[PDB]
Amino acid sequence: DPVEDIIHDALSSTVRRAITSGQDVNTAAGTAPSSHRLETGRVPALQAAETGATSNATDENMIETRCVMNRNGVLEATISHFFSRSGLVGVVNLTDGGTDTTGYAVWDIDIMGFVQLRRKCEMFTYMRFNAEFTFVTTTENGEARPFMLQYMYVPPGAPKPTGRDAFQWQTATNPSVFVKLTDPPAQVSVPFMSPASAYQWFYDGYPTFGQHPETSNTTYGQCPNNMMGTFAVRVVSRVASQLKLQTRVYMKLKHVRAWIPRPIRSQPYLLKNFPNYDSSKITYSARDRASIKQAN
Amino acid sequence: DPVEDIIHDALSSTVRRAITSGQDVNTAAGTAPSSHRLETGRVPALQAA
Amino acid sequence: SDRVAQLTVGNSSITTQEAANIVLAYGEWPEYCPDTDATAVDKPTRPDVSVNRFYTLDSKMWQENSTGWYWKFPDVLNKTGVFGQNAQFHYLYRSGFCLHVQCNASKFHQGALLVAVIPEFVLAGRGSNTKPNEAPHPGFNTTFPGTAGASFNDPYVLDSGVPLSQSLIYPHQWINLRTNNCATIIVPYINAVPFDSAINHSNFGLIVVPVSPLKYSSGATTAIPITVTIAPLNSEFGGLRQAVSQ
Amino acid sequence: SDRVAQLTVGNSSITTQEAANIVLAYGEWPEYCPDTDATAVDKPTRPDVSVNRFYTLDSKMWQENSTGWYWKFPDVLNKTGVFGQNAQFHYLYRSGFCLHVQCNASKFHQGALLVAVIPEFVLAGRGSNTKPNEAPHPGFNTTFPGTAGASFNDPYVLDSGVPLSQSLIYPHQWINLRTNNCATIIVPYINAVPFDSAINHSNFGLIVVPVSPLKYSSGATTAIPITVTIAPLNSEFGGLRQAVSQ
Amino acid sequence: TNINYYKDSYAASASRQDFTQDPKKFTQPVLDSIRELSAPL
Ligand SMILES: CCCCCCCCCCCCC/C=C/[C@H](O)[C@H](N)CO
Q1: CATH number, domain at A199?
Q2: Exposure winner among B39, D29, D194, D215, fewest CB in 10 A?
Q3: Ligand 1 pocket mutation, candidates A89, A108, A109, A231, criterion most atoms within 8 A of CB
Q4: Using CA atoms, how far apart are residues D32 and D236, in angstroms rounded to an integer?
Q5: How many structural domains are present in chain C?
Q6: Where in the cell is it found (chains C, D) (predicted)?
Q7: Within a 10 A sphere around the Cβ of A24, how many other Cβ atoms?
Q8: In CATH, what number is assigned to the domain containing residue C190?
């Protein structure tokens, strides 16, 4: 009342209507019949890409069409069913031989190591989902042999194992999976465990403050809200079992939510965490032709 | 009913109104008085052949 | 009726005679962090007139063989005005932006600029070294250029591996020297956290690429500059302590 | 609001940015022959999408000293498309037309074209022989030019004795290079019989005369082409038999 | 009628598949709604 420039905007800064309402689209859109229209001033073909909006010239407004009760399905295009298929994520090599007196293997959980799934899950900038992990484990030749294995999950902070029979393997608190090599692959479900509200595959910034160099800026882009710990694997034994072992990990993304789409990468990958490429060999997205007006 | 792009135009291709109706003109047209009009935007002299 | 337009924020205003539209990024206005999404318990600060205004960066001269420029936000506004001071004194920052890029030219010049925003515009090191200990990484001044803004080295890949063709999925707008002379984009706060730092993480980046190169006949004006102006909208700051530049 | 225009017929469309009007010839739309006026007893055929579309003839280069061109209808469309085949297989033909002539030029060129239709455009033999047995008569290719279209020899008399000045009583339209860049005319079926042959009698002819000659300063574009496009509307054919070209 | 054998929601299989599109936020993210049959400018 005494001063009202402060109340006039406080009661005007509520949720501003940004109507972009969507509708439940079960099947693809049909079409409606259209005759010829010889009219001036109403031009659906003339657009303006400079407005940042895509053309809305539909079929009925341009050519004479019939009507079709389109019954085609669109369910296989939702991101849920797009990421619902498991793919390779990481492979560990456990050489428990006489010359390799380690006994355990360790894998930093990072799905950015194999391009097949990285290329998909990097077309979106912010993703939030639950994963379904499946561990197949074979020998180097691909054989199964009745040796019991232990997979331990080491979240960020816990002590990583230091030996085949170290105390860390007691897994009093860490989740762990004991399974034999001659059993179905071990499958578990992991939730959205990031401290943030969504995983981000691109983090345009630095983790910490301070002076940042210009020669080896090895810390740029590395977001900590992504690193989710470590995966340790061993064979349950006191003495070495002479065998070469190989554990492959597959992850399924369920209950997915994606945000801020992104162009799909064209140049090949060179690094795991960084989106590096080479300016010497720029692989153009379109294959080359002989001439422009000679469509093959 | 089963296919309706064929009915939508059959019942739309009737006599299209092309109104150019004439009137019975017995004598030549008269004229009506007119004062001076100093207005913008309304120009009867500017035509487009 | 639709070509003319006037934006007004704070004590500043922008006119335009040939720009025809206002691209609202992702169909959402900049708003304050609602209580159901806030994590910080302290009370933030909301000047709304000291920082919400149109800051005009320097101008970049469009040459016949230019390659494009990029800016980072809110990196550019970290040393200018009360926005710069609030961002240097506060730890948590949140705000949307209103971009406006002007590049006027006579009705005889020709060319087209692509003005887009790239949420989380992570740059890339251009080099074929595959070991992570010797691989080249972009320097600090190349990734956080500042108010000056940096230039591209190969815009066909946006210095980020991704092709420029699909970059149109981003909130974008063209500057076609035959129809419009400036492009404007209202972008909200795009981040995976309610608030974030203003000196470490840059929410997004602005991209200006001369797709159709500048071309003109002799005698015309050769100095065709590009000017960008930015207005932080619905800004909040929190976590006050001593001033840290970076 | 009135300069922009889009016509659409069949699977074809035409845009235009500077043409401002649609001349409906004699204020009547093309319609089908009503039963109260039909004489043929057989049932005609009405494709309405195979033939009703915009066929684009070749382009004629407007020179500084050009003299004008003329086309005959439906002579032009007797070898192209399903219209050509229907007209070669059927004896009785009936249809209206939609003409659209484009001749674009910069805002520095000047000139004016007269685009008119002449129902029953009978050409004349240019010669002073008065005996009907030695008098000159126009050859077949001069009176039915075809898709190529023919040129005038003295357009001031329209090659038909009548002066060009009064030719404005016909359904016409100007192409003035300062205001508009294309002219369009919707003409119905104009004939003294319900149906007629499509290879013997041409209902009307199109006339394009450069009244105000093309004039431009040096350096501008010299190749100024004229393009005509035709859409047969509400077409009917009858009397089917073997194919007769002429 | 899908079921989950564990009391943790993130163990279910495909709890809810949805048909919800909203292209008008990527295809027409503009301020003043452009009509489909009128001139843009
Ligand atoms: C005993 C079970 C061991 C297997 C379960 C290990 C926990 C899995 C946590 C997965 C965290 C989300 C998926 C990972 C995403 C990306 O790799 C990171 N954001 C960085 O690349």
Answers
A1: 2.60.120.20
A2: B39
A3: A109
A4: 8
A5: 1
A6: Host cytoplasmic vesicle membrane; Host nucleus; Virion
A7: 8
A8: 2.60.120.20
